[PDB]
């Protein structure tokens, strides 16, 4: 139902499992509760957590699809966690 995520500095999150299976690494770890990350920044983790709900909610509907707001500064290190997670 609920899975646990740990950031680099200790930022700890709880995520619904339906959104949790979206990530390949999370799916692999759960298939093989509590998930720990070592180098993922807290702000980057907070930004990437919301994309799971954004994708799940708008998976079927394609009416407007508002643009995802990404700052130019944060996009450089967003891929840092995006590649590792997926």
């Amino acid at each position: 139902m609920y899975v646990k995520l740990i950031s680099s500095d200790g930022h700890e999150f709880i995520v619904k499992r339906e959104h949790a299976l979206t990530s390949g690494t999370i799916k692999a770890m759960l298939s093989g509760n509590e998930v720990n990350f070592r180098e993922i920044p807290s702000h980057v983790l907070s930004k990437v957590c919301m994309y799971f709900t954004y994708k799940v909610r708008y998976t079927n509907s394609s009416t407007e699809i508002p643009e995802f707001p990404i700052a130019p500064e944060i996009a450089l290190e967003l891929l840092m966690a995006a590649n590792f997670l997926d």
Partner: protein, 208 residues
């Protein structure tokens, strides 16, 4: 003077009633001059129950087939993933057009540009590199080919690949092939005013 910067300012005549001579006719002339011997061309190989073309790229292939059916039209099936898809013969509404064959034109525009589209090397963009060699429309195609359709890698890379300049490809280009009929491209968004970020994020690559 300082150099050879005369060109055709004196040789430009126009002035019939068009007016605004600078930056309008010169732009068209430069666009035509640049796109003469730049790019690849379509070529015909193999013939078994159908005419087949595969172009001359060497790195980003594209297979098209045309049967002998449609005795008065244009089927022009093309290979995507692992199946053949029909370009289209006639669409009742423009809405059915934009959304059913944009995948063909998007890959066709990129496959004609002459660029080093090998060694993607995902280790790029990792330590602060931008890969300035590729154009705006070429890096987008590379990202589409090498990324999952909706993961968080078509979005960050597109944001990191926004500073690249876009070259205007004229409508009379992407033509002059050996084929005497060719499909008609009723869509200018792919060649001018290029694709928005919201349309490259939901596109399936032909390559598997």
């Amino acid at each position: 003077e300082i150099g050879p910067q005369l060109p055709l300012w004196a040789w430009k005549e126009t002035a019939f009633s068009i007016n605004q001579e600078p930056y309008w006719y010169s732009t068209i002339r430069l666009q035509g001059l640049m796109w003469n011997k730049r790019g690849h061309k379509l070529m015909f190989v193999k013939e078994n129950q159908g005419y087949e073309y595969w172009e001359t790229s060497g790195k980003q292939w594209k297979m098209e087939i045309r049967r002998d059916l449609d005795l008065i039209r244009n089927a022009w099936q093309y290979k995507s993933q692992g199946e053949w898809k029909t370009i289209g013969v006639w669409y009742e509404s423009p809405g059915d057009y934009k959304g059913k064959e944009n995948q063909f034109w998007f890959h066709w525009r990129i496959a004609l540009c002459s660029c080093n589209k090998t060694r993607w090397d995902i280790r790029e963009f990792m330590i602060g590199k931008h890969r300035w060699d590729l154009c705006k429309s070429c890096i987008q195609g590379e990202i589409v080919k090498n990324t999952n359709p909706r993961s968080l890698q078509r979005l960050a890379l597109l944001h990191l690949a926004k500073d690249h300049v876009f070259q205007v490809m004229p409508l009379w280009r992407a033509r002059r092939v050996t084929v005497q009929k060719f499909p008609w491209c009723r869509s200018p968004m792919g060649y001018t005013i290029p694709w928005s970020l919201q349309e490259c994020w939901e596109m399936e690559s032909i390559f598997e």
